[PDB]
Scaffold this active site. Structure first.
Site, PDB file in Angstrom:
ATOM      1  N   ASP A  37      83.333  36.516 -36.008  1.00 13.17           N
ATOM      2  CA  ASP A  37      82.910  37.857 -36.408  1.00 13.17           C
ATOM      3  C   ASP A  37      82.341  38.638 -35.209  1.00 13.17           C
ATOM      4  O   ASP A  37      82.811  38.463 -34.087  1.00 13.17           O
ATOM      5  CB  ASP A  37      81.891  37.734 -37.553  1.00 13.17           C
ATOM      6  CG  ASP A  37      81.947  38.894 -38.521  1.00 13.17           C
ATOM      7  OD1 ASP A  37      81.566  40.015 -38.126  1.00 13.17           O
ATOM      8  OD2 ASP A  37      82.342  38.680 -39.691  1.00 13.17           O
ATOM      9  N   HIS A  80      77.242  42.938 -38.921  1.00 12.56           N
ATOM     10  CA  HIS A  80      78.220  42.337 -39.835  1.00 12.56           C
ATOM     11  C   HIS A  80      78.246  40.805 -39.743  1.00 12.56           C
ATOM     12  O   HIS A  80      78.140  40.112 -40.758  1.00 12.56           O
ATOM     13  CB  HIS A  80      79.610  42.915 -39.538  1.00 12.56           C
ATOM     14  CG  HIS A  80      80.657  42.559 -40.546  1.00 12.56           C
ATOM     15  ND1 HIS A  80      81.504  41.481 -40.391  1.00 12.56           N
ATOM     16  CD2 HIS A  80      81.016  43.155 -41.708  1.00 12.56           C
ATOM     17  CE1 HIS A  80      82.331  41.423 -41.420  1.00 12.56           C
ATOM     18  NE2 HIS A  80      82.055  42.427 -42.233  1.00 12.56           N
ATOM     19  N   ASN A 107      89.735  44.987 -48.276  1.00  8.10           N
ATOM     20  CA  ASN A 107      89.128  45.981 -49.173  1.00  8.10           C
ATOM     21  C   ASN A 107      89.966  47.230 -49.429  1.00  8.10           C
ATOM     22  O   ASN A 107      89.429  48.340 -49.477  1.00  8.10           O
ATOM     23  CB  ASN A 107      87.759  46.426 -48.655  1.00  8.10           C
ATOM     24  CG  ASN A 107      86.924  45.286 -48.144  1.00  8.10           C
ATOM     25  OD1 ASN A 107      86.755  44.257 -48.799  1.00  8.10           O
ATOM     26  ND2 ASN A 107      86.372  45.477 -46.960  1.00  8.10           N
ATOM     27  N   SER A 166      84.369  40.756 -47.228  1.00 11.23           N
ATOM     28  CA  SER A 166      83.618  40.165 -46.114  1.00 11.23           C
ATOM     29  C   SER A 166      82.380  39.405 -46.584  1.00 11.23           C
ATOM     30  O   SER A 166      81.971  38.439 -45.943  1.00 11.23           O
ATOM     31  CB  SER A 166      83.151  41.251 -45.140  1.00 11.23           C
ATOM     32  OG  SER A 166      84.119  41.555 -44.151  1.00 11.23           O
TER      33      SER A 166
END
Ligand SMILES: [Ca+2]
Lengths: 279, 5
Positions: free
Chosen positions: A39, A69, A161, A224
């Site tokens: 990430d 994130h 998404n 996520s």
């Protein structure tokens, strides 16, 4: 063990019904397992990780998470308060820049890295990789995820998404990995969650409270956020000896809450990650 | 992923 007033997602994965607030889990808590979070990085110094997190690789100028994130996802895997597997070891691989973006070549290199690096680590209970990232279809990205899984790592990836079929997205569309959709606290498919035949499992993804950079916390939404729930659950189950890296996704699907979700299109699995804990 | 969280 029981965590009272837990984040709703943790409560949900330890219950057959929505609306509970206690997270029930075995005290082993994923000890002896390792989870690679691939990430934006991890703020390893956050008190919530209790020294169990470390950066092992960056593809940029710094190993610091300047975005948040990665830290958030890592928190859902294994932070004290917000984590599924509260005693797992966390390894950060920074393949995304501080704007949350990254080239496919870098993401692939990061996956290849984990396949090799795990051989240098003491992870007696097994190895998991959590990939809360993706973009348009790429056979090379899919191949890299397939290699990582093949090497003996439990690979969990976000469905995406776009409220669309995940078949057009990578690494979501790679069949051999564990592709994770998102649900909300009322057991509805998250409005943004991708769907389709390639999905293996759903996890909590709407309004997920976890760790953030600067030693803080915040609530955010996405597939996520669902992915690390499943990755953490896998690490937890491997530590208990219930499953292996090769079969964890199948085992999770087999032991899931079935038929609980609404707004699931025909052809998509109706399965929600569940720990089957009984005191 | 896709947008992926
Ligand atoms: Ca699969």
């Amino acid at each position: 063990a029981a965590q009272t007033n837990a984040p709703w997602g943790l409560a949900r994965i330890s219950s057959t019904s929505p609306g509970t607030s206690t997270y029930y889990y075995d005290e082993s808590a994923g000890q002896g397992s390792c989870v690679y979070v691939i990430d934006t990085g991890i703020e390893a110094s956050h008190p919530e990780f209790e020294g169990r997190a470390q950066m092992v690789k960056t593809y940029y100028y710094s190993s610091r998470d300047g975005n948040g994130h990665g830290t958030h996802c890592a928190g859902t895997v294994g932070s004290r308060t917000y984590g599924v597997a509260k005693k797992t070891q966390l390894f950060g691989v920074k393949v995304l820049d501080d704007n949350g973006s990254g080239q496919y070549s870098t993401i692939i290199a990061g996956m290849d890295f984990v396949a090799s690096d795990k051989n240098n680590r003491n992870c007696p209970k097994g190895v998991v990789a959590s990939l809360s990232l993706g973009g348009g279809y790429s056979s090379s990205v899919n191949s890299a995820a397939a290699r990582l899984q093949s090497s003996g790592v439990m690979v969990a990836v976000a469905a995406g998404n776009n409220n669309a079929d995940a078949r057009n997205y990578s690494p979501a569309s790679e069949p051999s990995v564990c592709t994770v959709g998102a649900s909300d606290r009322y057991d509805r498919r998250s409005s943004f969650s991708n769907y389709g035949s390639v999905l293996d499992i759903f996890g909590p993804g709407t309004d997920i409270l976890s760790t953030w950079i600067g030693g803080s916390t915040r609530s955010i939404s996405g597939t996520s956020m669902a992915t690390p729930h499943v990755a953490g659950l896998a690490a937890y189950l491997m530590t208990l000896g219930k499953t292996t890296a090769a079969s964890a996704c199948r085992y999770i699907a087999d032991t899931a809450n079935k038929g609980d979700l609404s707004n699931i299109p025909f052809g998509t699995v109706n399965l929600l990650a569940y720990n089957n804990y009984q005191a | 992923g896709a947008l992926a969280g």
